């Protein structure tokens, strides 16, 4: 979306080109990306929806976009003599419009996506200069009946918040970092500290691939304690 020859760049090109049209934009997009990438892909005609034109995949699943109107919605050539008029007006409008050559575009090359990608990076840097924390206020139910919830709707809030992506990235590694406090007392039922952990692990039939006790806690994939859950009880 952001690199050169990306979607935004191509949209800018078509906002510059003499006689560009929505069909030319769609073509240029396809010929520049289709097949030559994986995220970008063709829309699927189904579901009675009017028109999709290209499908992207994000951390929150796939989504296909409609292209009609993107050209004349993005071009915004800011006039200059009228801005001078504003600067010289007698109201307080001039308070807004108060008055290098490299990387500055012309008053005829202006485009919305550019200002977006500019202030977006302004954020993504000044926010990158600050320690983060996160809160995800869900709405679990259509109406105001507390305690009761439906999954599909909170499933949507799951992806829009993408916390499932966090649990996935922490999910393909060692999610379970646990001490001996419960490990010894729950696993001594098969072979009735560190060397005691080695004894209690070699004896309950686990291979040395899907776990690791580094020096303080033992690290575990998720699906292995369930294997023990039913077996570490007898």
What radius of gyration do the chain's Cα atoms show? 28
Q: Which of 22, 41, 87, 109 binds another protein (CB under 8 A)?
A: 109
**Interface mask toward another protein for 22-61; x: CB under 8 A:** --x--xx--x------------------------------
Do strands 54-58 and 61-65 pair parallel, antiparallel, or not at all (unpaired)? antiparallel
Q: Is-contact 203 190, C-beta < 8 A?
A: yes
Give yes or no for residue 72 binding another protein (CB under 8 A). no
Shortest distance (Å) from residue 59 CB to another protein: 27
Choices 99-107, 146-154, 194-202, 217-225 (CB under 8 A): range interacting with another protein: 99-107
Start-end of H helices in 127-189: 151-161, 163-169, 180-187
Alpha-carbon distances of 5 from 53, 60, 70, 91, 109, rounded to whole Å: 18, 24, 17, 44, 17
Residue 107 interacting with another protein (CB under 8 A): yes
Residue with tokens 């050559």: 101
Residue 108 sits in the site that holds another protein (CB under 8 A): yes
- In the list 46, 95, 102, 148, the residue contacting another protein (rule: CB under 8 A) is 102
Helix axes 194-202, 180-187, angle to 10 degrees: 40
Q: Which one of the spans 98-106, 119-127, 185-193, 203-211 is the region binding another protein (CB under 8 A)? A: 98-106
Which residue, 93 or 108, has its beta carbon nearer to another protein? 108
Collect all residues with Cβ–Cβ distance below 8 Å to 112 and sequence separation of at least 6.
73, 74, 76
Name residues contacting another protein, limited to 4-23 (CB under 8 A): 4-5, 9-10, 12-13, 16-19
Closest approach, Cβ 11 to another protein, in A, equals 11
Total residues in contact with another protein, by rule CB under 8 A? 23
d(CA 177, CA 225) in angstroms, rounded, equals 12
* Residues in contact with another protein by the rule CB under 8 A: 4-5, 9-10, 12-13, 16-19, 24, 27-28, 31, 101-109
């Amino acid at each position: 979306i952001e690199k050169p020859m990306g979607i935004f760049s191509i949209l800018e090109e078509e906002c510059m080109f003499p006689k560009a049209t929505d069909t030319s934009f769609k073509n240029k997009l396809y010929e520049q990306h289709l097949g030559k990438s994986n995220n970008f892909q063709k829309p699927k005609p189904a579901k009675g929806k009017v028109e999709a034109h290209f499908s992207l995949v994000h951390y929150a699943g796939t989504v296909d976009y409609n292209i009609a109107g993107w050209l004349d919605k993005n071009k915004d050539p800011l006039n200059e003599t009228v801005v001078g008029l504003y600067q010289k007006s007698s109201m307080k409008t001039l308070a807004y419009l108060f008055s290098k050559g490299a990387k500055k575009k012309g008053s005829s090359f202006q485009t919305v996506s550019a200002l977006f990608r500019e202030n977006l990076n302004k954020l993504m840097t000044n926010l990158r200069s600050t320690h983060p924390h996160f809160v995800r206020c869900i709405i679990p139910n259509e109406t105001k009946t507390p305690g009761a919830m439906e999954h599909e709707l909170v499933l949507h809030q799951l992806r829009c918040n993408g916390v499932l992506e966090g649990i996935r990235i922490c999910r393909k590694g060692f999610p379970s970092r646990i001490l001996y406090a419960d490990f010894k007392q729950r696993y001594k039922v098969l072979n009735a500290s560190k060397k005691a952990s080695e004894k209690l692990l070699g004896s309950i039939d686990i291979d040395h691939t899907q776990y690791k006790f580094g020096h303080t806690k033992v690290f575990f994939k998720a699906g292995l304690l369930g294997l023990l859950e039913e077996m570490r009880d007898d």
